[PDB]
């Protein structure tokens, strides 16, 4: 089960993840990346309906073996807070950013807020796959995976 999103050049985009939060539990959020800059065409990761032997059939993104070997897992940003209040000016969060991937490319790091990642000017260095994780002090863990590719490749 993965989300399919289509973007266009010079048009902004945003990714939001389903969240089921409970007040009073200290919470941590993590964002990741998985690029496809060197993985173009059929070698690029693609959505396929992977079916089990008899019971389970779900959508999953398949990545080429060479592309996977040329791809390294990276951390984009980490957020820590505690759920409280209804507004947003009453919610403080602590952010840790160790993402050096976008520093060498001389690009703009994405704008990350609780449950939302936004990019203003889409380029060809932003395409790929994103992994989002939420953990808590009660032992709860939730995972999600987004996929952003070029516009028009869905039909093909």
């Amino acid at each position, epitope marked *: 089960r993965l989300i399919e999103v289509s973007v266009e050049e010079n048009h902004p985009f945003t990714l939001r993840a389903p969240i089921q939060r409970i007040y009073g539990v200290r919470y941590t959020e993590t964002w990741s990346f998985l690029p496809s*800059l*060197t993985c173009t065409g059929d070698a690029a990761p693609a959505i396929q309906h992977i079916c089990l032997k008899h019971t389970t059939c779900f959508q999953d993104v398949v990545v080429d073996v060479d592309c996977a070997e040329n791809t390294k897992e990276d951390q984009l940003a980490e957020i820590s807070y505690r759920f409280q209040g209804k507004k947003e000016a009453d919610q403080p969060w602590i952010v840790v950013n160790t993402s050096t991937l976008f520093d*060498e490319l*001389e*690009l703009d790091p994405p704008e990350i807020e609780p449950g939302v990642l936004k990019v203003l*000017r889409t*380029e*060809k*260095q932003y395409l790929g796959v994103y992994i989002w994780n939420m953990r808590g002090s009660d032992g709860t863990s939730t995972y999600a995976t987004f996929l952003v590719t070029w516009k028009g490749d869905e039909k093909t």
Partner: antibody
């Protein structure tokens, strides 16, 4: 640092083909834009085209499409410009430039010396 | 095709004084303007990018302001090495048009 070098001056005759080379060194050649600019004494400074030496994607200027060819060599890290048949109105100075940042919408960061 | 006008066509600024150069566009270009400087027989160099930022190694005497369709570059103190041609370029829509240029001379 950043280094861009060019080839020597060219004197030719009408009806002959030509190719010029611009060599880059000092960074990762794949994930950046390099392009060409022409200066002629009488119509000022114009842009010609840019290339991204990682997928060989091209977007020429409307005026210059079908008059030149821009190519990139990732092995030796060199950009190439090709003509078809040198006309008498193609005598000028030429520059190869790399963008200041990694975006498509940026000015000319580093320049060469000129052909 | 976006057209641009450079104003004025000639400057005569004595040492110590300052100068103000105006670049006028035809349509809106947002913040995508760049300012270059060129000397006799040398490659142009980048002075201002994004209409507000200063490139690495550029002295603070160059201040670039403006927006929309009108931009201005101001220089406070003119060193003996700062009389040359100044160009403004846009990178919003292609064709990317340049300016004819403005020349700074020495008054006497």
């Amino acid at each position: 640092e950043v280094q861009l070098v060019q080839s020597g001056a060219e004197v030719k005759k009408p009806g002959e083909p030509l190719k010029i080379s611009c060599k880059a060194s000092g960074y990762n050649f794949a994930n950046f834009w390099v392009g060409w600019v022409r200066q002629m004494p009488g119509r000022g400074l114009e842009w010609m085209g840019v290339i991204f030496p990682a997928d060989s994607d091209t977007r020429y200027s409307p005026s210059f499409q079908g008059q030149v060819i821009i190519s990139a060599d990732k092995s030796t890290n060199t950009a190439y410009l090709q003509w078809s048949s040198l006309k008498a109105s193609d005598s000028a100075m030429y520059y190869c430039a790399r963008h200041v940042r990694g975006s498509l919408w940026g000015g000319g960061g580093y320049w060469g010396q000129g052909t | 095709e976006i057209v641009m006008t450079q104003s004025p066509s000639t400057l005569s600024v004595s040492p110590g004084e300052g100068a103000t150069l105006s670049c006028r566009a035809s349509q809106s270009v947002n913040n995508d303007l760049a300012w270059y400087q060129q000397k006799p027989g040398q490659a142009p160099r980048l002075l201002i990018n994004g209409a507000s930022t200063r490139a690495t190694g550029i002295p603070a005497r160059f201040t670039g302001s403006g927006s929309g369709t009108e931009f201005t570059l101001t220089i406070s103190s003119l060193q003996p090495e700062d009389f040359a041609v100044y160009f403004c370029q846009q990178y919003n829509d292609w064709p990317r048009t340049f300016g004819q240029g403005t020349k700074v001379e020495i008054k006497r």
